[PDB]
Amino acid sequence: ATPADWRSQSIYFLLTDRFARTDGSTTATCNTADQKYCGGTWQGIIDKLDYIQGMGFTAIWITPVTAQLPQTTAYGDAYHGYWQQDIYSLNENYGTADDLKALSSALHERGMYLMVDVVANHMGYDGAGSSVDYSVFKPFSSQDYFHPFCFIQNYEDQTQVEDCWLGDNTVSLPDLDTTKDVVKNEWYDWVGSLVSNYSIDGLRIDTVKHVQKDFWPGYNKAAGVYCIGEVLDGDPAYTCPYQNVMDGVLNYPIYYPLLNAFKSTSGSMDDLYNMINTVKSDCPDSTLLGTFVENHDNPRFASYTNDIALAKNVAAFIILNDGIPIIYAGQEQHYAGGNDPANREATWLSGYPTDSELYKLIASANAIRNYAISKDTGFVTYKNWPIYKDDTTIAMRKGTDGSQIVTILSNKGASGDSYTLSLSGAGYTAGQQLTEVIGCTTVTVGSDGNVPVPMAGGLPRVLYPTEKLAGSKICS
Ligand SMILES: *[C@@H]1O[C@H](CO)[C@@H](O[C@@H]2O[C@H](CO)[C@@H](O[C@@H]3O[C@H](CO)[C@@H](O)[C@H](O)[C@@H]3O)[C@H](O)[C@H]2NC(C)=O)[C@H](O)[C@H]1NC(C)=O
Ligand SMILES: [Ca+2]
């Protein structure tokens, strides 16, 4: 599927080993500290697609599928998929080729997309960089395919970042020489055939900043689908230019100020407001980036604060910001693990309840985004616009005049007082009735254009014109 097809999508990102077992157990042990395979599979995912689609997601991003190093190392097993060794075989832990094809098929029957995580930068090896036996890699079975062994020392030095190796002498990540034609041609053949064989709709590309820019356009073309790259840097001046070589990137620039604004009742709304505008104007296309506040490479949101209202606000923001929302499996069950491996909790241990507070919040927010898109062909390309901020509040507006969604977020938290916010800048017409679609109440725009928004319990508010909801299931 094309970048244009992807704008409307909403992604649930999961770790295949950690999301759902074939046997559907909600009690099977998964001790994150042990860093071992816990038994999640592609068949497991198929059987829980209703859980995901019930939150209003239209796509999933699963971790890499290639055969990995087989050892249990001092850092555990390759359960996460990022330590590949044989790119033409699949990771048997997750199932067979037929199972991966069954997963893509199942998503397609539901009108959903499959996005697969891929690594081009490196293989993985159990042991010291100096001791690597290159014959174990397929098809890159020779030192000649790789950059000389050195570990990255200075992440400020982009040459080193691209040319030296990730990992360490316990698990080393041999760095492919992506400047060689034989390497490029092999990867380009591979990714086109991977996409074809498994009917993959999009790719998430790992470790993009660690491969020279002039590798990516050919890879994105060979894939033939939308690619979103992991460029792990919060500076928009460093990260957004990667959109010149790849369709999208993960929105790490928004990540940092977004997390800071809501992780406590004293977070900075100014920083978030300003970053929204910075990304809007400076990135080739904000509407092709992926918004997130939780993933497998940072502490989860709830690891900073257990306040359920704060978690509701940040989830609402992710869904209603420019670009493609991305929620990480567990966020909807208010998982609170810190840094890797603590943030790779098994989703099944939650019991998958569909009545958790965040499941319902996420469902409500995806519901209105999906509906708005179905009625407003301009919504996905309309640039999200911050219209208001104060010490504890940010409001923003996205959508064509007459159909815009206006979102008011608060960092007051669960102890927030009940008051009326006099909201200016929403751009509705005097006297227009709006529905607050999270709590299903109504508000009417004043004759001066102002919207009186009832605030309470630190809760997010999401407004949309009532007449436009006619015939929908939203607040019915
Ligand atoms: C998707 O399925 C296709 C079709 O089976 C796979 O095609 C196979 O690709 C391999 C690997 O490139 C080809 O391997 C051989 O490599 C040697 C080079 O030493 C070459 O000289 C041989 O002629 C041959 O190409 C193989 O021919 C090809 N098999 C077929 C039946 O076309 C493809 O690899 C799969 N893609 C993925 C990512 O699984
Ligand atoms: Ca590299």
Coordinates of N, CA, C and O in Angstrom, one line a residue, residues 33 149 151-152 156 159 175 184 221 275 295 306 337 340 347 350 405 410:
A33 N 12.8 -10.1 32.7 CA 14.2 -10.0 33.0 C 15.0 -11.1 32.4 O 16.2 -11.0 32.2
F149 N 35.5 -4.4 11.7 CA 35.0 -4.4 13.1 C 35.5 -3.2 13.9 O 36.7 -3.1 14.2
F151 N 33.5 -0.7 17.3 CA 32.2 -0.4 17.9 C 32.0 1.1 17.9 O 33.0 1.9 18.0
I152 N 30.8 1.6 17.6 CA 30.5 3.0 17.6 C 30.9 3.6 19.0 O 30.5 3.1 20.0
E156 N 27.7 11.4 18.1 CA 27.7 12.7 17.4 C 28.4 12.7 16.1 O 28.4 13.7 15.3
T159 N 29.7 9.7 10.6 CA 30.5 8.7 9.9 C 30.6 7.4 10.7 O 30.4 6.3 10.2
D175 N 28.1 -5.2 11.1 CA 27.5 -4.0 10.3 C 27.7 -4.3 8.8 O 28.9 -4.3 8.3
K184 N 23.7 -3.8 -1.6 CA 22.5 -3.1 -2.0 C 21.6 -4.0 -2.8 O 20.4 -4.1 -2.6
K221 N 12.0 2.0 -2.9 CA 11.4 1.6 -4.2 C 11.3 0.1 -4.3 O 10.3 -0.3 -4.8
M275 N 6.8 22.4 19.3 CA 7.3 21.3 18.4 C 6.2 20.9 17.4 O 6.6 20.5 16.2
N295 N 7.0 2.8 23.4 CA 7.6 1.8 22.6 C 8.5 0.9 23.4 O 8.5 1.0 24.6
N306 N 1.4 6.9 37.4 CA 0.3 6.0 37.3 C -1.0 6.7 37.1 O -2.1 6.1 37.1
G337 N 6.2 -0.9 32.6 CA 7.6 -1.3 32.6 C 8.5 -0.2 32.2 O 8.2 0.6 31.3
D340 N 14.1 -1.5 28.5 CA 14.4 -2.8 28.0 C 15.3 -3.5 29.0 O 16.4 -3.0 29.4
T347 N 1.5 -9.2 26.6 CA 0.2 -8.7 26.6 C -0.9 -9.6 27.1 O -1.8 -9.2 27.8
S350 N -2.4 -9.7 30.8 CA -3.4 -8.7 31.2 C -4.8 -9.4 31.2 O -5.7 -8.9 31.8
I405 N -12.2 18.3 13.9 CA -12.1 17.8 15.3 C -11.3 18.8 16.1 O -10.2 19.2 15.7
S410 N -5.4 18.1 28.9 CA -5.0 18.7 30.2 C -4.0 17.9 30.8 O -3.9 16.7 30.7

